[PDB]
């Protein structure tokens, strides 16, 4: 029932500008913080901007600071990303993502389908292995080593996402250990401080995907490079 529909993607000459829009529905838009998150041609997820529920607070990574402006219209249920001085590195699929409120830890629960842009002491997460092949019925184990603790007041701000090609990421695990509603129990997450594990067992056919870890402990939000999981 909750949906996020992006629009506005396309081709832009370097130096040019572009404005993305996300039409929200099926929820009380004004109650949720929103972000833009992009995925580069190299399949890296990169956080691009966050805006608070009321709009008073906006956050950006240094890579887009001064060039991107996130904004919202709580009357129209619309989220915006105004981009200017666009460069090659900005080439990516851009998703909007809602910050969930059902749990204490910060996480992205709903994502839009994405629109594509073609231009023509940060916490580092070391995820491994980069590539993983498993046989049906076996176990897959994906590891995250964080460059500093992602704990805050007794909780670990570590999330795991699954992404199948052509689709947005999908939350599997939030706060290191907790299974999101609707996710089967053969997925499990573990760890604390700087060491985290995503486990899948027994692996089924439809688990073929790329998996990402993400910390929400500190801005900039950061993701692991990804683990592409192949079957048989």
Domains for the chain: give ranges and CATH numbers: 1-120 (2.60.40.10), 121-225 (2.60.40.10)
Torsion angle (degrees, nearest 10) of CA 181, 187, 219, 83: -80
User: What is the spatial distance between Cα 171 and Cα 179, in angstroms, rounded to a whole number?
Assistant: 9
Sign of CA dihedral 155, 157, 163, 167: positive
C-beta of residue 32 within 8 angstroms of C-beta of residue 50: no
Resolution of this entry in Å?
A: 1.9
Alpha carbon distance 161, 167 (integer Å): 12
Experimental method: X-ray
Cis omega (within 30 of 0) on the bond before 129? Answer: yes
CA–CA distance, 10 with 84 (Å, rounded to integer):
14
Neighbours of 14 (CB within 10 A): 11
Convert 171-186 to b/e letters by CB count within 10 Å (16 or more is b). bbbbbbebebeebeee
Residues 56, 71: Cα–Cα separation, whole Å? 10
Measured from the Cβ of residue 3, the count of other Cβ atoms closer than 10 Å reads 13
Encode 15-45: b = buried (16+ Cβ within 10 Å), e = exposed.
eeebebbbbbeeeebeebbbbbbbbeeeeeb
Distance CA 149, CA 192 (A): 8
Q: For residue 122, what are its two tokens?
A: 């940060």
What is d(CA 150, CA 193) in angstroms, rounded to the nearest whole number?
6
């Amino acid at each position: 029932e909750v949906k996020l529909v992006e629009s506005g993607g396309g081709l832009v000459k370097p130096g040019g500008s572009l404005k993305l829009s996300c039409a929200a529905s099926g929820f009380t838009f004004s109650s949720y913080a929103m972000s833009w998150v992009r995925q580069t041609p190299e399949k890296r997820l990169e956080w691009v901007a966050t805006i608070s529920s009321g709009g008073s607070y906006t956050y950006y990574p240094n890579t887009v600071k001064g060039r991107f402006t996130i904004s919202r219209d709580n009357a129209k249920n619309t989220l915006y990303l105004q981009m200017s001085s666009l460069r090659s590195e900005d080439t990516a699929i851009y998703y909007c993502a809602r910050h969930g409120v059902r749990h204490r830890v910060d996480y992205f629960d709903y994502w839009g389908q994405g629109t594509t842009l073609t231009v023509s002491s940060d916490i580092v997460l070391t995820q491994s292995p980069a590539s993983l092949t498993v046989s049906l019925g076996q176990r897959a184990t994906i590891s995250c080593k964080a460059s500093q603790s992602v704990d805050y007041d007794g909780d670990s701000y570590m999330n795991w996402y699954q992404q199948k090609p052509g689709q947005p990421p999908k939350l599997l695990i939030y706060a290191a250990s907790n299974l999101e509603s609707g996710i089967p129990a053969r997925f499990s997450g573990s760890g604390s401080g700087t060491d985290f594990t995503l486990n899948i067992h027994p692996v089924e056919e439809e688990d073929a995907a790329t998996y990402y870890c993400q910390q929400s402990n500190e801005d900039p939000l950061t993701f692991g490079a990804g683990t592409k999981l192949e079957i048989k």
